[PDB]
Amino acid sequence: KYEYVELAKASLTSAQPQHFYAVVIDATFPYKTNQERYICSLKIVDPTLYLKQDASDYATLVLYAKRFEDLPIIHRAGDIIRVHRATLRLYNGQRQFNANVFYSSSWALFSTDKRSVTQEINNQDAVSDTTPFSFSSKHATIEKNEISILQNLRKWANQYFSSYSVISSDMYTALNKAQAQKGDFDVVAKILQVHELDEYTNELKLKDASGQVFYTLSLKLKFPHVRTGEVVRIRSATYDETSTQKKVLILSHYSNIITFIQSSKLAKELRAKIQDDHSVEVASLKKNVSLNAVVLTEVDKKHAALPSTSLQDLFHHADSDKELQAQDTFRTQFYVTKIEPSDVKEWVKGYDRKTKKSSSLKGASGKGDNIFQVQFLVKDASTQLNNNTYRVLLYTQDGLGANFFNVKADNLHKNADARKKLEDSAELLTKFNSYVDAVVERRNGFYLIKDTKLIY
Amino acid sequence: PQQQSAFKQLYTELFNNEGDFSKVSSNLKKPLKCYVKESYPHFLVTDGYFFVAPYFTKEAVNEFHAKFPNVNIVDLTDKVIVINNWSLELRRVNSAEVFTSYANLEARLIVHSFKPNLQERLNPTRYPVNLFRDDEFKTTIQHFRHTALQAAINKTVKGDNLVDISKVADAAGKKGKVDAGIVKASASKGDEFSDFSFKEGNTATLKIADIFVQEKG
DNA sequence: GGGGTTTTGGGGT
DNA sequence: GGGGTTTTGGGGT
DNA sequence: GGGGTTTTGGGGT
Incomplete structure (x- = not known):
């Protein structure tokens, strides 16, 4: 029997393992740090911790593992994650939940929308609304008393995304200001085109609210969910100063391209406001x-x-x-x-x-x-x-x-x-x-x- | 405008000049000061923006082992090297096996002479990326192939052998095999396109493992 | 047995 | 070790 | 202490 606790109500003093359900709004791709270690960092939210007094507030979740396969791949913001045995501690003012999957901790992912990203790509239906679409270890058990927790959080996940941007202006940088950053930054943009550069790579054509167009390489296997006309959040990009002919973003192995669930207010407005650009094409026809x-x-x-x-x-x-x-x-x-x-x-x-x-x-x-x-x-x-x-x-x-x-x-x-x-x-x-x-x-x-x- | 990456400018000019190293700008054939990212199993050096793999000649390592005794090459990781004598060649390879290549083509940095500077050599740089994974560079190589491919196809395909209109406009009671639309692009030998005009440079080089046995059997 | 954890020698299954 | 940098694979890492 | 596994009591840290 597991007792689920809300993010803001979890104990900072009792360094005992705690369990919780939450909404994922951001996450790195699972990445390797050395020879026996993989990490996945994500930002989580729930009814007790979702908003600073305007900009979105959140807790952080750091998952540690010995294998790549033991960490969650977050393709979409808005879905839910259930974690077992996390220890909570304060890290520079934020509530940070740490879980060693390689030991006794586990996670399970639940789709907020009817289908999961993967199910949408392969046109499959979900077994049921109580089935995890991805999880760590060989098994995952969901009890009858968890069903209400899940359904309620989904209901809340949709209210939250439809009435707030969630990915607030402080969580990304305008593309036309990209060149001014010292290091990496985040971006929120509309995919204008998906070009098959080669057998393994797609080249995304991006445009954000500032109107600047940028390109970036996106591996087919890593981000199979990219689609023209959709809005995504790119977690961790750097401006390429070596690209002279075109504006390019460089992604790293820990970078992630994230879509939004259907109810997303931000994705909806950006889908309508950001219109197609052909200026790059017209200028290139003179060369x-x-x-x-x-x-x-x-x-x-x-x-x-x-x-x-x-x-x-x-x-x-x-x-x-x-x-x-x-x-x-x-x-x-x-x-x-x-x-x-x-x-x-x-x-x-x-x-x-x-x-x-x-x-x-x-x-x-x-x-x-x-x-x-x-x-x-x-x-x-x-x-x-x-x-x-x-x-x-x-x-x-x-x-x-x-x-x-x-x-x-x-x-x-x-x-x-x-x-x-x-x-x-x-x-x-x-x-x-x-x-x-x-x-x-x-x-x-x-x-x-x-x-x-x-x-x- | 101005290309910040010495390597990217060099390799791009080589491909944009049909693999002819003599046609590349002379003001670019100056000594190369570069940081060593890795030394084993793969020797990779950076120019502050990208990393490429240098190909050392047997002469280059013997000369090195003389002017700098006991200073092992396979241990140069995180230290700098200055290549005084070097050349660039174009080689056909298997991109599925060689990661420092693309579309079965590789631009090699042939090293003839290099000196190590252990002198607390620094330089705050961005994370070095494989030049052969770069958007613009991959595009430059695609341009190269497109040019070779188009020249070969306009030489090979002649006589306007257009599908007879009846075969398609009156296709009721007519079934066909799609492979009828397959047209050979050149006078090749196998299934791969190889009708290029750049003369593939040869030049013998050492396998990174031989230089590891020469220093630590 | 062996990890990770600390239980630091010993449960149940 | 977390806003980070691998290579069981150097085109998921 | 507790998993999974089999070791079915007992290392090492």
């Missing part, structure tokens, strides 16, 4: 070499929620994998290496609906209706190292991808205006660091671009 990635296209709103499929899967596994065989519409990202036919003037051909044949507008047709018959030779992160380039089509005779270039099909041998706009788009598409975000439809072994248009 011969851009160290900044530019996503030239935008997919139709109805696919915004459709998951992406790599070129590796699209061309090497699409006829063998059960899941990929049942689908005919996909979303993928890639960069264009070459565009065929070479002559931009031949991108638009005359099409005969009856004979199913297209022809060049040589002696300028009637031979059929004008259509785009463009073949892109692409490549992506998942195929970066191989000796292949892949064919992706923009054959608009049936309407798929008709507005891709924001230029209605026309005889490019006669319409100088149309030809020029397509020529400019050609240089942009083949330019280093330019990428395409597109939806494709599989027909007779080929992929045709559809519901996708250039935004530059």
